[PDB]
A paper describes a structure:
Rift Valley fever virus (RVFV; genus phlebovirus, family Phenuiviridae) is an important example of an enveloped virus that harbours a class II fusion protein. As with other phleboviruses, RVFV displays two glycoproteins on the lipid bilayer envelope of the virion, Gn and Gc, which form higher order pentameric and hexameric ring-shaped assemblies. Virus entry is completed upon Gc-mediated fusion of the viral envelope and host cell membrane, in a pH-dependent mechanism.
We first performed fitting with the localized reconstruction of the pentamer at 7.7 Å resolution, followed by fitting the resulting Gn–Gc heterodimer model to localized reconstructions of the hexamers at 8.0–8.6 Å resolution. Consistent with previous biochemical and structural studies, this fitting verified that the Gn and Gc assemble as heterodimers, which form higher order ring-like pentameric and hexameric capsomer structures on the mature virion. Domain A of the Gn forms a ring on top of these capsomers interacting with domain II of Gc, occluding a surface area of ~950 Å2. The Gn–Gc interface is formed between the β-ribbon domain of the Gn and the hydrophobic fusion loops of Gc11, which are shielded from solvent at the interface between Gn domains A and B. Surprisingly, unlike the rod-like array of extended anti-parallel Gc dimers predicted from the low-resolution modelling attempts, we observed that RVFV Gc forms a kinked conformation, not previously sampled in crystallographic investigations of class II fusion glycoproteins. Sub-tomogram averaging and MDFF fitting revealed that while non-membrane-facing capsomers retain the pre-fusion configuration, membrane-interacting pentamers undergo pronounced conformational rearrangements that allow the insertion of the Gc-residue hydrophobic fusion loops into the target membrane. This insertion event is achieved, in part, by a dramatic translational shift of the Gn, which unshields the Gc allowing it to form an extended intermediate state. Although it is tempting to speculate that the pentamers might have a lower activation barried to escape their metastable state than the hexamers, possibly due to less favourable subunit–subunit angles (72° in the 60 heterodimers making the pentamers as opposed to ~60° in the 660 heterodimers making the hexamers), this hypothesis remains to be tested.
Author numbering:
A (entry chain H): 688 to 1118
B (entry chain J): 850 to 957
C (entry chain F): 904 to 1011
D (entry chain F): 796 to 849
E (entry chain G), F (entry chain E): 154 to 287, 290 to 379, 393 to 469
Amino acid sequence: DPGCSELIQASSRITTCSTEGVNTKCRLSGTALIRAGSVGAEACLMLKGVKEDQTKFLKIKTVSSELSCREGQSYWTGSFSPKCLSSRRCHLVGECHVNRCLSWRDNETSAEFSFVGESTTMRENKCFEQCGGWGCGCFNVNPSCLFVHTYLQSVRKEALRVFNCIDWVHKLTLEITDFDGSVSTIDLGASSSRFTNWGSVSLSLDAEGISGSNSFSFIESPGKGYAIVDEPFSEIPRQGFLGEIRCNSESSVLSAHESCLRAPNLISYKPMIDQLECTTNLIDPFVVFERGSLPQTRNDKTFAASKGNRGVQAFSKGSVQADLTLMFDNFEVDFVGAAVSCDAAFLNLTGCYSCNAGARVCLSITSTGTGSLSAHNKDGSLHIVLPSENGTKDQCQILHFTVPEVEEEFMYSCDGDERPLLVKGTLIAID
Amino acid sequence: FNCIDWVHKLTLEITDFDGSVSTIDLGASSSRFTNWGSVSLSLDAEGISGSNSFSFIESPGKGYAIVDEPFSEIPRQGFLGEIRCNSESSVLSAHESCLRAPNLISYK
Amino acid sequence: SFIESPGKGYAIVDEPFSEIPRQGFLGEIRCNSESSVLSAHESCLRAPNLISYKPMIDQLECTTNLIDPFVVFERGSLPQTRNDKTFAASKGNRGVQAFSKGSVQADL
Amino acid sequence: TSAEFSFVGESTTMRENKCFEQCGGWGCGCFNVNPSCLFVHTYLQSVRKEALRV
Amino acid sequence: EDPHLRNRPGKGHNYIDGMTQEDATCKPVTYAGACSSFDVLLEKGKFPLFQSYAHHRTLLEAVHDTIIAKADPPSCDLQSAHGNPCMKEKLVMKTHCPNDYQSAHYLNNDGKMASVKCPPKYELTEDCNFCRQMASLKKGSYPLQDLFCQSSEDDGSKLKTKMKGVCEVGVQALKKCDGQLSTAHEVVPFAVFKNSKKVYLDKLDLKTEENLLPDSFVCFEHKGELKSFDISQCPKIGGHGSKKCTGDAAFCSAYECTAQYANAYCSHANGSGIVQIQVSGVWKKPLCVGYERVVVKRELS
Amino acid sequence: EDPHLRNRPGKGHNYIDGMTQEDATCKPVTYAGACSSFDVLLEKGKFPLFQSYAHHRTLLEAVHDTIIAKADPPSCDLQSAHGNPCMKEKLVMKTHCPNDYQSAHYLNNDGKMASVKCPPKYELTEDCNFCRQMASLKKGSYPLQDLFCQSSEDDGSKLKTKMKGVCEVGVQALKKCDGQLSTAHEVVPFAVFKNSKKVYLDKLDLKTEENLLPDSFVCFEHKGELKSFDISQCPKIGGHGSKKCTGDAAFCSAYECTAQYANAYCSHANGSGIVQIQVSGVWKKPLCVGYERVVVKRELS
């Protein structure tokens, strides 16, 4: 919500441009370190030029402190239902004999089911022998054969992506506003770097990092939510455990293709001469998803999901001190037009001093066009960066002070004409 | 067979709208498919363990048996399970597809 | 784990050596020479599916969580003081030079 | 290597191809109601001028 | 095991009203002749269901044996405009007929025998839905489905199509759907009984039993080899017969064996008997089991 | 699928000025005829992008359809006197023109139609940058780029080349520089719009948006075997029409199907419609998209 707080000046060693047809253009190519703001504070960059009003800002807003989980191994799973097909045949009839049902293979295509066709789904064939003679339908006393063709098929319309985590990485959500106004929403973690159209960003220095999640397995449910399960990650699929049928995508689970992995002897068969009752002991993950669901408090930490984006987030009581870097890979910034004038006013000043929270300043800006109002003191120690619009709009940010009785005369401007603005207020001592 | 986990099983019989009555069972988070859809245990309350060193023997039509030893994973002589197969016909007819212990016959 | 930067300096990281390149870790994409990294050759070993994709029918996003080594190089860098030794860089050639205490008792 | 990116040809770069399915019908651009397919060709490059020998 | 594919019990006829040009080599169907409506049923890789079930009766043989009725009209002409009763079901059925063909028979919703015919001198397309222009033409019909039947009189008019979670399939209207109806041409099983409509299926549970009817046994002679001998001239248990014939336990258990006094060796048909199906937990005797590639609209939303 | 690589929609004119002697075998372009300016586009291993997008319009077809203008002069005289209009754009282009060729066409900077021609009795070399004297020569040209066009009227003159880390690509002078610039022959895409310049890009994001257009459907007939049929005779919805045609849902949604009464079957073309590109953070409808091997000047240090 507030504006910038930590403002730095761009050096001339990483800025080079010219002017063609009354069009001052600049280019950024280098690396500039900047201090990260607090919860809600912003960190912008001042980009000057050959005049005074030709100035564009590069703001970076910090949402809050988060403790994301470092993912690694994952697998898709869901619900499945078998489909068994019985076909009893007497002995010495085609391929239904004693020298075939004993050495029958699962991937061996049966001749009796040869009219089924080729399918890319999980299927299996068996040959359960039965009693012969004239009491059940056989011209010989040899035991009859039972051709079984069972294929798995899905009954649900969604899948779950079960993943784990071995370390907790401190993640910071940053909403970066560029020079022209192209807003973006990214995030950083430990030493990660995001590639943006203007270059890249990376977390320079942090001061938060916990560990303790090897005995926890998370379940991802896109469109509904997440889930927490208190068990180690399933590496080997087996019958009777959460995660017996794994795949690689959601469509592979909804279609039950043969490209996934499964455990042998999973489908149970109960033949009754002519009947065939084959069922499976599949563990429904929706039950555990209904039981355990984020947010959940484990030991002394609060686990939850993310706001908008997909990902697990852990909340606690971290620090706030952090450093950031800015990499410019030769970006061009133009400024054809020019900014207009605008008057500023003082509304209120509520906050603190000598603390990371700062002081919340509230001002009133009255202008006629879209511009960028900026104020500065006399000794060159504090700066005010506030975007101006058309009409009368109030703008407040977070400032830093060291004395309780704040009373300083500032100089605000929007196009090259500076005007005084005496501000005052009483703050509280917050460490 | 063996057993590495214990699930609180709940035997439930089903009485549908027309009058079809079946007999199924549930446990933990298992789900059974019925003609009217499916059923699953939403919440449980039990679940013990401690059977990795116990091997069970299934005898259809006669009964079961309990043996105080781990599951036989390597077919070897002098132990319960020196000659195994895959089905009942492979044992009643001595099929060569089953696994046996290397050199288990003493020749003199 | 040490990081060599010829022409700029060295770096020290307090972690064991990574044998298998894991995603989201310092050193997930390895190679054999400098040209294999500056040109991204197919002979270099990298972590499986480390690239995140976000398709939107017509649009297509793809972000990566690659750990920037220059950040750690800026954080930890020689000289450093650990336990009781004075870890420093080279003074002429190349190689990490650790400094300690003691006289001279050697024969050539 | 899919035929849709057959214009790329042979290359010694760590590249990969994916196939993310999308919705079909007249709302996206297809005459059939079946879900459509998306061909992805992602390759990695180096935006730096130096490397590190760990 | 036994090479008895062309041996058709009963009448063994393959001709329909309108395409009786092959009546010379189609009535009956012996080991010789070139019948266009029987060769494609023996090709490896086409219809293996008839290959595994050779000792049965096809749709045409069922019509000739007063089992399956004939539609009206029996031969739907593909020349008359403004449509005709034989398009709303043919257009929604993805088939594939080879070159040089005129008529094409298939099963309709009413359980009768339908067939499309092109006027001379026209032929069919690559799918058999429409007609087009082109050598000679195969004067006959091509099986569009993978069905079979047998001789029975089991009633089954109180059973309709179930298919849980399916909007509309083929030409029947199970329920009024309004959400996302997934349309995909897929194969669908079916088992039409007697005096019933096209009853679709989901899972197949077929059983085979030993039959004692004369239309389920063979009896060949050895001349100076093999020779087609009719089993109707065989004796009975305690009766009297003109000719003699021997056999095994299945032949001697129902007839009479004369040991060396016989002149023809008989045996059981390798792939016959009474084949029943399980419908709604009841083992009924079907009359038209097979697959057909039709439109499958499954409820997605 | 859909083997319609030679069936070019629209007029189908593949001949450039200066070498208009192939009018009999290149105007129009059908399944028959031997055109040297169209066969090399169908060779496996040369231009696979045209093989993937073979259901659109080429650059020459776009010129003949009053979409892409021509340069002045359109035919670059290879035997001029100290330079000619079309030399710097040709030296930086690394191609491999086959032997027995004379003309070579490509896209210039202004987006017009570029081409060079050698008078008899000359021919091109191994790279097409020079010529010599010579069996029988070709009667056409050779495409030096891998581009395609379509029918569009959208304006895009407010977009220029914005490449990252590139100082001078091809012949366009982007940004200034005087340090170490690496010189190498690499592949670079290009998408010329309408009333604009040759804009270069780094990544290609093309999407297909099918609709209802007469140039996106193929209608064939059957005679005494498939035969090419003119789609212009297809009747409209409540409009005019002579012959009858039918097809699937997309072909019948804009025309009128008469079931089996129609005498022509049509279907949708494989890869056609409105193919848009992602540029400047927005989707646009370009008029030329392709690749070309040119010189890339990057800032090494």
